[model samples]
Target: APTEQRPGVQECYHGNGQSYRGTYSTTVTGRTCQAWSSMTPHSHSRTPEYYPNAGLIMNYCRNPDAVAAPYCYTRDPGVRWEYCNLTQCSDAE
Candidate 1:
């Protein structure tokens, strides 16, 4: 399939209104990161269609010194949910 082999058609992370609500459209392509999506936890969604998407995944990762409490890791993402399981806590301990 040489002619059909265009390559790089894997949409690992599209991140449509899934994350930025259009603010990050230019930042991310219409794809997802396999590792990031397949290895993390889930954060609750604003609605039913969103419970599986990553609109909230980025929300936690981007939080300042974020701590991943249970409330943020059980909802599940449609594609990628790894960005929310772990957290970068501050050195305040």
Candidate 2:
């Protein structure tokens, strides 16, 4: 299988950002993101094994379910998940 190569710089999204693969790992409240492969603190079905193309690497934020925008499970147990602070791609780009 061919390995997917991520761009050196990917910090924004387009529209709903279902394909956004940036490495924004913090939540809206400055909380560290939980690893998609871990069940500690929070357990979820959106794992890298399930959503292979979701870019579920490390604790990076992603829109695996085609949600409003990129989001991730937070390290803070109190918070299950939160949207990430990502900028929309400009038309120029």
Candidate 3:
């Protein structure tokens, strides 16, 4: 794909485990994660193609002692998510 931009494509979220990107936006609350996708539908071919075939993954800290407490307020990698592991973080193992 060359690129995905407006016709006013915007990212939206809901309590449901789904990520969306399109011309319309939605509103919801009590959600934990946000995953956005590029608008696949073009002005030329406005097909309703979007993402989240597998849906959003919410990895809750079921074990607070091992997962939540250890990483509640962790340091950043100081890199964009795409380049995260490339940058080193002493605080992270």
Candidate 4:
């Protein structure tokens, strides 16, 4: 599958243990962490489909610390997510 340039399909576990993404983006604050589907959605079949499910895994931990956590971030390695790493370069971490 081709790679996407979006931050939606990723899993980020902060040291704090919080998470957010997609529509959840509005709900998440402070610490953030998200676990995404490994395989792309079976349905949708469109880019818009990708937009909604584009949820994220936030790392609640401060910043560098959250990212420093092992198994904290990982891009969809194919399957449903078909995204890069759950890691996003944010000062908030």
Clashing residue pairs in all predictions, respectively, total 8, 0, 0, 25
Say which candidate scores most in lDDT: 2
Where does candidate 4 have its weakest 10-residue lDDT segment?
24-33
Scored against the true structure, residue 27 in model 4 reaches a CA lDDT of 16
Cα lDDT of all candidates, in order? 0.29, 0.86, 0.21, 0.30
User: How far out, in Å, is residue 16 in model 1?
Assistant: 25
Q: What's the C-alpha lDDT at position 63 in model 3?
A: 14
- The lDDT-based order of candidates, best leading, equals 2, 4, 1, 3
Regions of model 1 farther than 4 Å from truth: 1-45, 48-85
> Where is model 2 more than 4 Å wrong at Cα?
1-10, 91-93
Give per-residue CA lDDT, model 4, range 22-70, as digits (tens): 2222112222222332222232222223434323234221222223322
The C-alpha TM-scores of every prediction are: 0.15, 0.81, 0.15, 0.16
Question: What are the per-residue Cα lDDT tens digits for candidate 3 across 30-90?
Answer: 2221122312121211112331243212311111122211111111223111101111122
CA lDDT, candidate 1, residue 35? 23
Candidate 3 at residue 36, lDDT?
28
